[PDB]
Amino acid sequence: MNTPEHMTAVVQRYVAALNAGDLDGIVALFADDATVENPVGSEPRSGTAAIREFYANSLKLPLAVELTQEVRAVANEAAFAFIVSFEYQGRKTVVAPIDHFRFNGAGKVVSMRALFGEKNIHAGA
């Protein structure tokens, strides 16, 4: 069973791996047949290869990632609020999404969706 402690630990590990640029660390949290929809509304990317490619590309820039509130976890799901800060096109940018994870029996993330829109993307020029 997915304990709240496990799902919370996985969310923390995810954020830590992103903040450190640990690609293998991020991918290791996902099932081999998992799906990533980032952002919500974009083409779903499934399978280890597609997931690795997505994060590999995201990590081409140093990302400062931090949780901004307590993790919500119940049943086999977790949701969390956080910020991702980086410099893009010579402008300080802070994105504030809410991510949602679904876990399987092995405690692996089988589906992740990052919900953020244009109004959650803050570029300070």
Place this chain on the structure above:
Amino acid sequence: MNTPEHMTAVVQRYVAALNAGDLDGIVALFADDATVENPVGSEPRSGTAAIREFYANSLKLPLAVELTQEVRAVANEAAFAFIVSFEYQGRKTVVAPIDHFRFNGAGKVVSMRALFGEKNIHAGA
């Protein structure tokens, strides 16, 4: 056509309605075949009648509801972090869930899922 601005406005109306105990106002935001899963993992309430009953029971005891961060809205979906505060017989409780709304083309909410676990239910004060 359902847009990000519309969904965000609906989340604001939803929170204001919860604070006013406006059952009709809350229900008016949902589609006829909408569903409510509170909390995530429990049997979903389906249809106007069931949804109304859910909110009637959920608001018997007055709730102070507040968005704690910006609303996230994109492609027919929205997610928001907030708190629900109430007191009963001297016992204060603050619940911090993350809600996920899915909207249909007509701009009505077809799905509401409230993700929170016991770790998100804070007693004491």
